[PDB]
Amino acid sequence: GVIRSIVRAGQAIPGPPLGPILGQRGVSINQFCKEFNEKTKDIKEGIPLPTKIFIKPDRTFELKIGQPTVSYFLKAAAGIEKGARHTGKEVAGLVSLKHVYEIACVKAKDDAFAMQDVPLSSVVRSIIGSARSLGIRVVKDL
Amino acid sequence: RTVSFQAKESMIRRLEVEAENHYWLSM
Amino acid sequence: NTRHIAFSGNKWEQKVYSSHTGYPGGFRQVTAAQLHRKDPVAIVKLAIYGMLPKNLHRRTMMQRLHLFPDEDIPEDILKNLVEELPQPRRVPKRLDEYTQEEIEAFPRVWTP
Amino acid sequence: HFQRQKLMAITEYIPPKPAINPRCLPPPPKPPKEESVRLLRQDIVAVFRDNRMIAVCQNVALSAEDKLLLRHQLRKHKIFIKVFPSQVLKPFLENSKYRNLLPLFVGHNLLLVSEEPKVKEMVRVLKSVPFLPLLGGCVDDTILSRQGLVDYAK
Amino acid sequence: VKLVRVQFCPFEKNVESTRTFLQTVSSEKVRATNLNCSVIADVREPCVDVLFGDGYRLIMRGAHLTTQEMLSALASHIRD
Amino acid sequence: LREVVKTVIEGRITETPKATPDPPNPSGQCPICRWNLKHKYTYEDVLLLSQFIRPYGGMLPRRVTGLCREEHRKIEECVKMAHRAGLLPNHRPQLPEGCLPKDKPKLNRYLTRWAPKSVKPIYKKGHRWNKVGMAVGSPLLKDNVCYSRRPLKMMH
Amino acid sequence: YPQGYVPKTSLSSPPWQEVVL
Amino acid sequence: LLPVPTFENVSIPERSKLKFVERVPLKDIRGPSTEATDFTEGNFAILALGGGYLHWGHFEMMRLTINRFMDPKNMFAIWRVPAPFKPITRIDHYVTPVKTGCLVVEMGGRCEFEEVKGILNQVAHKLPFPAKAVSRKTLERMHQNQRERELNNQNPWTFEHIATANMFGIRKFLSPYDLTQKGRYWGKFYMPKRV
RNA sequence: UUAACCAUUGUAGGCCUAAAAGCAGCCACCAAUAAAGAAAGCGUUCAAGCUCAACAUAAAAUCAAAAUUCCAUAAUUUA
Ligand code: FES
């Protein structure tokens, strides 16, 4: 069973958001954190990571992780930790072309998140759309 | 009180007769 | 052959006969099917009685009426009998009643 | 009153009766066909014209993600997994280079479209999934069997 | 059902019923349900053979049998 | 028409009876339209009805017959009337394994719109203007040709 | 079947019977 | 496929909600509707099929129900009738007389008829008179159907010819208003199927 | 319009929310793919998770005729 979470690598035992939710199906919580901690060492600590854990009926762990979220990076790039109430029109940061493109080039390395499209148009739309989801406007130049 | 079939026909015939009276009063 | 009469539609289950003895709790309502089960000839007699004129002569006419549930008849009645009357309703034929020649004549409208 | 009611009944509207009911009507003409779907024609036309030989294999209950992975796998084989809704596939022959390949494209089946006669790469794709059945390969856009495909491929 | 064998000739006249029946058997959900089954498809009239451990072998030809008849017959057998 | 013989089984496609050639009205969308029989059949016309019924009295699928829905409802209603009247001795319901009839007498009925099982008795008949009506015939057959001076009394 | 042919049924033919003078 | 319809041109007034109706202020309802028979702003409304008396509770039922369910972003509502003024002695309540064919409430905005059919029908059922939810397209179809039935009538004798010609002295047993109704309106009720 | 089938991936996207991920609130409202609603009803310690819309494969086509005891009998077609 696929369970998607965005928990940060820095903390390997968030508690309710992972521990019992994975535990409810029936798993070893300690085992989950140890492998997540293994991911934490490889990756920078304190940055959210999408996970695609599959909880099979055999009570086994199939942990798959990818690049850190561009959404949080856009929030960090805009210097925003907690956004506006709505964020539909509220904006606190503007991102230019060069910053947008640089991250996209590195982004196209994971078998997950469908980062295999030859054209970069697909890549930009997700981050552009992600910025729309966040309180960020992606202006061409400022 | 639903109208009998015979009653409807009888009035129609009389109406036609009065129509003939109208034509002969038209000249 | 009053036992073998046929009722159109659902008259068997829908027609109810109501009679009152005249004493307390004397009201009786019986369905046509129940009445036939109790007596096959009762239904035929009741219908004729109602159709007959509501006069003193009706009772005398009922005496002259003879109702037999089945084909059995006394021999003397047959000697008294002068003529038989054609059945009012033509009986539709069943699948078996249809002749083999008729089946051949009838066309097959569609092919499965 | 009863008398007024009599007038209403006579004045009641009388509807005319059609000669033949719509279901039991004689065969009437129908409007000319219109191609809505037209976009999908261009995509399939390009891929089939580009690729002379097409290997037609029935699609097992595969996942969308795997198809992209298999699409990349064929890129190693120099083949492309380009597929589109099959309800527009049948009219492809109506408006395309050929009109006679309809029987080959029957049902829902994976199409391996290759422009080059790299037999080994095509055979390797067959080796990827044995349970998946390969209907055949129309080498040089000529109808052929799976066994014939190998024989001609040799 | 330990094994299910489906054989049909696509190049020659191929019956839709047997081909459609193959799709139902070759499904991610159907295969998981009858996990014991080993799915083998023969591609080259069509003959479908299913082998059971108890020795019951059921052979179905789709030339004059629809997929529903095979599915109906197979479904009862799987329950056992 | 396919029949299956039965494990190893074999299905044989057998010859099906063909419709008589030269319909009176060729090009009719439905067979009734083809044969000009729209308003000339009744429940007593078992010969036509039997062709569209299962061997045990079940209704055949409309798609196989190809007739329009209007005739489908009319034909089904006519067949229903025949069954309740005991006019289909060879299409009687199949007894599943070993069941036998209750052996009680069957009342002779015809022109039965609804099943006698589910019809309640009418205790209160009513007066002249409050009389209750007893359904006779079916609404689906209103359009049938009538040879009487006045329309037939559906409610008795 | 010839044109204008109607198989005899309950409703195909009138209840009255034609006569020839 | 074909392009989807759009309601961009539609403009929603600021006063989306319905205004309050006062509790308190002879053939008013025995005739055909002469006012509010045409759609003014919205494409949907409620059409009176009978002559009824609308008390304050009915107005609140229309006002409260419409306001709670309507979307100010895409919907607006207006009042097509005055407040109750006719007293009902026990005075228990006051009512607004309505004539057959009067539009009582009109709603518009960026919405489809099907969206408002359920609410309008519920309001119509709660109304004191028979009523039917109507729209610009549906209302025209009713008139088009009304015209078609009238045009193709096969009756040799018509109500107007007999009434205007005083055949059988029918006018002795008919009211003066009946000539205008032409059999389509009886008392305070209107017969839609009378053609 | 309404009958069969299926549901991948960005992203638990920002919001006081412990946490709310389509689905507590709250947002604006894009992408890839052949086909995915930044979600339609469900589920909700929160989520996992049920389906509807997706794509493929189905097939259709303007309203009727309360307390004494039931109360004519009946009846669908010969002009
Ligand atoms: S008679 Fe033609 S469709 Fe029924």
Residue numbers in the entry:
A (entry chain J): 18 to 159
B (entry chain o): 25 to 51
C (entry chain K): 61 to 172
D (entry chain I): 41 to 76, 79 to 150, 155 to 200
E (entry chain k): 13 to 56, 61 to 96
F (entry chain r): 35 to 40, 47 to 196
G (entry chain S): 50 to 70
H (entry chain N): 62 to 86, 98 to 162, 176 to 280
Excerpt from the publication:
S-adenosylmethionine (SAM) is the principal methyl donor in cells and is essential for mitochondrial gene expression, influencing RNA modifications, translation, and ribosome biogenesis. Structural analysis by cryo-electron microscopy demonstrated that SAM-dependent methylation is required for peptidyl transferase centre formation during mitoribosome assembly. Our cryo-EM analysis of the mtLSU from SAM-depleted mitochondria reveals ten distinct assembly intermediates demonstrating how methylation can orchestrate mitoribosome maturation. During translation, peptide bond formation occurs in the PTC, predominantly formed by 16S rRNA during the late stages of mtLSU assembly and involves the folding and methylation of the A and P loops.
States A1-A4 are the earliest mtLSU assembly states identified here, characterised by an immature central protuberance (CP) and an A-loop of H92 held by an MRM3 dimer, which would typically methylate G2482. These states exhibit a relatively low overall resolution (4.6–7.4 Å) which is sufficient to trace CP maturation and the dissociation/recruitment of assembly factors and mitoribosomal proteins. The earliest previously reported assembly state is characterised by an immature CP bound by DDX28, an MRM3 dimer stabilising H92, and the presence of the ObgE-like GTPase (GTPBP10) that stabilises H89 in an immature conformation. Here, we observed four sub-states (A1-A4) with bound MRM3 dimer, which differ in (i) binding of uL16m (as A1/A3 mature to A2/A4) and bL36m (as A1/A2 mature into A3/A4) at the base of the L12 stalk and (ii) maturation status of the CP coupled with the dissociation of DDX28 (as A1/A2 mature to A3/A4). However, in states A2 and A4, the conformation of H89 correlated with the occupancy of uL16m, where H89 is lodged against uL16m proximal to a basic patch on its surface. Early states (A1–A4) exhibit an immature CP with MRM3 dimers bound to H92, poised to methylate G2482.
